[model samples]
Target chain A: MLGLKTSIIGRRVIYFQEITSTNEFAKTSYLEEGTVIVADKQTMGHGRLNRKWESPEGGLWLSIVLSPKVPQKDLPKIVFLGAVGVVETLKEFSIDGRIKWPNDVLVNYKKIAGVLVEGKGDKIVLGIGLNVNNKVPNGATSMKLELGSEVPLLSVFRSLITNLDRLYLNFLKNPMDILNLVRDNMILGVRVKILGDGSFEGIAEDIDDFGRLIIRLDSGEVKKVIYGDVSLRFL
Target chain B: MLGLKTSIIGRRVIYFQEITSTNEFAKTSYLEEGTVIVADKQTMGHGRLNRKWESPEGGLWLSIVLSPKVPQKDLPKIVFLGAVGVVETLKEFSIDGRIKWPNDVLVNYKKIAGVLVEGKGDKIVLGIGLNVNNKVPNGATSMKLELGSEVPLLSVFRSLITNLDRLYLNFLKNPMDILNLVRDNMILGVRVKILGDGSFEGIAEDIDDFGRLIIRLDSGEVKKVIYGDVSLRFL
Candidate 1:
């Protein structure tokens, strides 16, 4: 019994016991912005870089439909903001969470949640997979495990939708603030390896106005990475 | 008689006596790469900024289907490269042509060609409106007018398809080379007005690796101009 309080996100929600993928459903259904799709489990859950995620019947798997009329370049920021929404939910429980940039959310350097933003036409489906009320696999942790006891799933859901609405509205108004907030919670100053376009290494630096990750490559050249199918990993 | 020489572009050409727009036809048909849609005349031709284009009979109003394996970010470069392809075709007639960055091809400071790149799913439809053998419009010139004679339509058409194939292959191999060539043929240093999100005046500097227009704005800041329904003006 989640008492969701939101103007846009979760204004209209659909819940299912099991689904192939909430992101897929959101995309296929051509969901409207603010419509939230949630499932108790995802049989074929997937993460960024084609990583299979285990959604064992009780974890939070949800996707939000967005049709923001922002510039096509600023589209990726929605995924970054989705990570922030996940952190906002965790903060309610006094859990210290940090964003791993572009995707994962880590607590104590262990992944606690993941976000996937997909585009379909002028709309985007921003999905979240948080470990809650279920046992997670290796290199992952759940809210119940972190708490050392059972936690309320409904409370977490409410907080997630609430924060998403709040942050999303602010993002539409002034995206720089959202980018700054994302930067503040990010794992700064790391050596990163970018994949999917061969192998390249760079020291992560600041983000440009276009939200490109300004990286100082080994050749001592500063490069700005904007978009691609490229995968990023901190080495 | 157009003796087209290409592996992909115009391999399966579709022509119309008249159409609403070649881009619309290519999009609605879900045309594959190598498929070329052309029109002898456009009843309602439009360019960037929704400006009306005079697409009279005997002009080149066509769109090429491209299902390139490039990422979404590399998408804009398709249009930028298309401008280059138009110039390549014009050079065969030994005509001096220059790219106006991102999408327009000009001959002697007058627009001779324009490109519009539209995307749907993994497919991108690249449309070009070139004045080949048509009556002159204000601030626009045609190959017929530039050549001071009615050039053979078939020869120009064949050259256009051939160059599109050649440049597209090079783009698939090493996009940087194509980008450099585009840069060399572009209006190097000019004051430009960019309109979309708002009005901003900037000195066009260079295009970044991502194909973004690097502009030194009036505010003394360099901006990487990415996706927007931008209207460009020479100041």
Candidate 2:
């Protein structure tokens, strides 16, 4: 049984057999900071804008409730931290992964994992769903497929949690340091198309210190892209 | 009886006699867009940093849930909008009011109201608490105190709700339009001191479009004050 373990960084892991959405459960439970709710399977997982997030039996679906001392404006940076942790975990298997802006982990231009961040005042519950040993029926990739047929979900989870703890500690000590890492590792500086009221093509530049994507439009104007789906060109 | 009233913007009004926090209740209610939750009193009314917010009677404490299709990055602007709405509502009483950065309404250098913005994905619950007919204890001042007499709480609530609806509609139409108004009404241009870690004094010059308060230090360089309690110097 993967029971609850308390963390100085503020999380108590509570594993479950199945759940609808860890985010929803955490919100309703009003779980304290560092309380993590994990489930073996999620029947109704969701991404940003309540979009359905597929969670299979062999996948990891969990949400961590965090009450950082940081201001609410800096809440989105948690998504970046989650991406770093995911990317670092994938690197353990010799799988090269990149982070798509907002919160998606991609391998060879296909999504392998994603994060959904929800905030209640200063408290934030970050729901992370990663495709581990499960096979992608439609159009998804997993570490098991990338690194041969055999894979261990527990090992991946350990690496992810360890890296997340380390990065979170680093963030508590100095956010700029973690932000610098995000800036260095961000993969937005490629040719991309932003979808919104009217689609527009732009070159994804570096993310600013505030974590906003700096995009250079075709008209040569530098626009700060905060939110929106971006389609990156496969190079 | 103020039962749920259907508005063109979204759904009906949901009333809560007592809640841990109006914002939390409103957000998790799965309420449709434009659903309003009016709490007579919040047991755990939250302030920034999980701080306790006083929710005594004779005050207006409520939250409006909005599921706008706006970009999540622009969500911080909702705090600015709430501040503007509260400030505009107070203006009806002919009291000199100013808006502090983030979301605080001040009258005569004292905080008269505060806003706590909560979000889960694209859904936002704007928690607003205003000192309407209540007597401002100690140094605080309400509409009654400022006007030198008591006022009907219902009238004040109606005014505030009307102002919020108008500004919220404007926000849906053009966010930048309201952003411009916030910039024009910012009260950070005066001399102030940053209250955190090591105290430092500076002049509040401007707030960047990202809602960051730009403080020009006496040492010549400008520092971006993202989070801190600021004390303004009275002229």
Candidate 3:
């Protein structure tokens, strides 16, 4: 379905002209694995921290449903796969994309895409928001801005879907590769500040096997951060 | 707001000609508490155990969104309140409805309505399927069938919404009252078969404050059943 070669991802596509949010819509449905809920625009799109996301007519707003047999703690791998898929898709368009630790896709230090993974029961909704030709907020860029022209929304969507399916299959065979891609795109080996619970500053070292950020503190100790807001600072 | 007298519970009503399921739609949205999703018919209506429900035209098919400030374990009280609210609505039509433990409303040993309570985050979707003026399958009846005439769907819906709001408010004041109403309508003090995780027969006893069935086994031992399929066996 929807020009997909793979069998699992995008097997069934539900498209809407407008919606509140693809992630919210996907959460409430009893769809099968690989079902995609896409929308041309979202009035209330959101990011990882429930922050507002600008979703207009030109953005590719969609959510992919997955029924992985892993426990809750292993769900961060799905986010890594999603970021890798987006970066790989961006590479197809000759636009270099990088993954900011956690769930953001950046192009030359400007956010161009994001991934929000939410789980309910045994199913997870991986929501991806890519600014294709839409108007973005300050400090953000879009594909149109980088490429200097508007690209076909369906092309980006199909490429992203294919890449996601392939990454998912590849992860099933060897999960470490997805984490490696996430780590490669990350800006590690730099000073960073973690801002959740009591704040702390440290050198970003590496991402653990569980997708957690392993940081080397100034006190000659290392700490692993899970689900915290991190800010990369220049030395 | 569908002619609601209460401040909450039916503040926003979204009506559709037909849908896959009201609960499904309600689950998938970021609607405020008290938003009611109503449909004239449901193509994929379901009951407590995801069993097929006959939701043809002329039935009261709806799901109410609620954000109760209770922990996960206390959610069963929402189901009890739902059943009690449904039973109270049936009484407005002069039909005596009884609560079949866990989540079903029956009239004269025949099912006339069912309550499906699904929780996500702090929000709960209270889906009520009441067979009103619809063609029901064997072992089921409708309000029209019970009254020998079609009652106004809006009238039933209004009564149900009002009753639910009152029960919810009453619950906030004193939760035990809702549990008492549930116990009053229960088929207790009878032989019952509990069918989950190893089968056992016992006298159907009182429902605990947490909505668990306190059953007295033949060995004179009481066993509390939580989330088990129960069958009321007539001696």
Candidate 4:
């Protein structure tokens, strides 16, 4: 019997010792809302922009299938929710982290986890990859590296599922709490570059009501960027 | 008395001999829904990526402010509406045109007009640029250039406003109609490239229910793209 603390998030779980991608399976599967798909290893894990994600054994690569009745504009908030959930789970292990805007969790200024929000029909497939006791690429750190010891992966998984379930339900009733939590932990007030067709360098100023990044460009022009690679330069 | 044919679209009109950009003005102004902003010329006009849109003296550069009660997911349809409206207007002038996916109108294999959809708070600003009796850049055409004579600018403007108003109101009642109309006129079944962070090439197959483009890549992977520049290769 699977012992998940939450009422909904992981009530029904699909486990695979190895899969191409948990997010891809979750998107195509006919599962109820709150069902989670977990893979021990992903041969084709990916992040935003279809960037390769190294999902080796011992990492938590999962996708939560949610059918939250939210306005499409508010769907972006769910990505932040996933980031906050992981951050809170890390806090349980005495590891502190902050979210880069849109949703990437960084611990001690090193990439630790990522969140990808995608739509399939009327559902939102929220994929999360947390580096636990796993091998990560350069420029990224894992729980084992940060703590100098490998933490129990199942313990972190259960905690994340429970935290996300609580936040997901709470979001249906009052999304402001989740939105505010993400805003509070997000990294801002730094030089950043937005990559896209009209790529520009700007100062990450604020997060708007819609969860968009408010950037003040070097040209002194302020604009809201929807989605793109936001490279932050701490200097 | 200004003779206009729209009930809601052009009932309240604000005109200027020149403005920085009709879209920019519409974004910052506190105006009622259905108000139309028109400028004879723009000092700083732009398109999808903030790319320069040359709003010469003889172009119809305008923005329509709308407060439609719609799910955010359905907002992209408004851009198609602008394209359909311009295509219909061109039809009245005996010029046949087809809509490039998402929403750019092409006549005789040349770009004739473009549409831009933007959001400000709860309101939507639909900006359109149609070259009529205007000089256009290379690879683009105008109504005057196509017809070999300048057409009445006011007539084209009124016709476009009326067509868009009818389609928009019809969209609120039965969006399927407008969606089908766009699909019918959209250029499909062609080799195309979707440009974005995850750029890829594929054959544009169809438009999905939520106005997303369905593409079948060379790798036989079928996927739906949300928003990106779709370049079609006719050859």
Two-way lDDT contest, 2 vs 4, winner: 4
For each candidate in turn, give its C-alpha RMSD to the true structure in angstroms.
25.2, 23.8, 16.6, 26.8
**Higher-scoring candidate on TM-score, 2 or 4:** 4
Give the residue spans of candidate 2 off by over 4 A.
Answer: A1-6, A9-11, A228-235, B1-235
Query: What DockQ score does model 1 reach against the true complex?
Result: 0.01
Worst 10-residue lDDT window for candidate 4 chain A reads A226-235
Indicate which candidate wins on lDDT. 4
lDDT (tens digit, per residue) of candidate 2 on A1-235 = 1111224322344444556877888887755566656676778888874578888777877787777767545667888888888889889889888887868888887788998888765577887888877767567788887877656666676677778878877777677776777766668668887665666778888887778878888899887777434443433
Candidate 2, B62-98: lDDT as tens digits: 8887866686556578888789888888888787778
lDDT of each: 0.80, 0.72, 0.81, 0.83
lDDT of 1 by residue, B34-145 (tens): 7887777889887876778888887888888898867556667888767988898899898888988779999988999999888877788898999988886899999988
- Which lDDT value does model 4 have at A75? 80
lDDT of 3 at A61: 91
Interface RMSD of each candidate, angstroms, one decimal:
25.4, 18.0, 13.8, 29.0
Write the candidate numbers in order of decreasing TM-score.
3, 4, 1, 2
Error of 3 at A175 (Å): 59
> On residues A72-168, what C-alpha lDDT tens digit does candidate 4 reach at each position?
5678888989999999999999999999887799998899999988887788899999999999989999999999998887678878988999999
Which residue pairs come into collision in candidate 2?
A10-A34, A11-A34, A12-A34
For TM-score, the strongest prediction is 3
lDDT tens digits by residue: candidate 1, A3-95? 234668875565555668989888987455788877777899998777788887668888989988775677878888899988888888878
lDDT tens per residue, model 3, A176-226: 778878887776787888777667888989899888888898898998888
